[PDB]
Amino acid sequence: GDWRTATSMHEFSVPDIDGNMVNLDQYRGKTVIVTNVASQCGKTEVNYTQLVELHRKHRAEGLEILAFPCNQFGKQEPGSNEEIKAFCAQYNVTFHMFSKIDVNGADAHPLWKWLKVQPNGQGVGGNAIKWNFTKFLIDKNGKVVKRYGPMTEPRDIEADLPKYF
């Protein structure tokens, strides 16, 4: 697959939660957090509340958050795209929600296959996504600059935003 040839997130297109293709080059010149989400995770509440807080705190500086539902971790995202959309409403999410995807395995979405092999997006302990709410920080040129594991509270990504704003 051609994802292997990409040098930037801006080369991918991915369906949003309504099913509509989003060309990610529209986020050129924005700092972006990409994260895999789920609704039935022990850290669902801390992640959605803190991602909303971080997005409200920094969206006027150009921060974007792209959230990808994924059911591969404990079957913790069983709902349809419509049900996930409704679920997020309780958190007042105004960042970008995407259609549910796989992030691991042969059928993972190409964007996520690409994120996992980026020099700053490689995990040791394999590149595989380990659980719900892994995060990647992506710069204004669509390069991965940091990867954060499932335990990372979204507020702790503040440490790294001045680097890239």
CATH code of the domain covering residue 86: 3.40.30.10
* 157 domain residue, yes or no: no
DSSP designation for 90 = T
Is the residue at 140 inside a domain?
Answer: no
HEC string for the chain = CHHHHCCCHHHCEEEECCCCEEEHHHHCCCEEEEEEECCCCCCHHHHHHHHHHHHHHHHHHCEEEEEEECCCCCCCCCCCHHHHHHHHHCCCCCCEEECCCCCCCCCCCHHHHHHHCCCCCCCCCCCCCCCCCCEEEECCCCCEEEEECCCCCHHHHHHHHHHHC
122 belongs to a structural domain:
yes
Radius of gyration of the chain (CA): 14
The answer to whether the beta carbons of residues 48 and 65 sit under 8 Å apart is no
C-alpha to C-alpha distance for 42 and 26, rounded to whole angstroms:
33
CA–CA distance, 151 with 149 (Å, rounded to integer): 6
Query: How many structural domains does the chain have?
Result: 1
- Please name which of 5, 64, 3 lies closest in space to residue 29, comparing C-alpha atoms: 64
What string of DSSP letters covers 5-22?
G--SGGG-EEEBTTS-EE
Nearest 5°: phi and psi at 161? -65, -40
Structure tokens at 111: 């964007």
Are the CB atoms for 114 and 127 separated by under 8 Å?
A: no
**Solving technique:** X-ray
DSSP state of 33: E
Q: Does 160 map to a domain?
A: no
For CA atoms 82, 142, 147, 156, give the dihedral sign: negative
Identify whether 153 is part of a domain. no
148: which strand partners? 135
Residue 124 falls inside a structural domain: yes
Among the listed residues 139, 112, 107, 145, the one whose alpha carbon sits nearest the alpha carbon of residue 127: 112
Locate 39 and state its tokens. Answer: 């609704």
Beta bridge partners of residue 67, listed in sequence order: 35, 97
Q: Indicate if the alpha-carbon torsion angle 63, 67, 73, 74 is positive or negative.
A: positive
Let me know if residue 158 belongs to a domain.
no
69 in any annotated domain:
yes
Question: CA 29 to CA 35: how far, in whole Å?
Answer: 19
Instruction: State this model's resolution in angstroms.
Output: 1.3
- Partners of 14 in the beta sheet? 22
Contact 131, 148 (CB under 8 A): no
Q: Which amino acid is at 35?
A: T
Domain that holds residue 122: 2-134
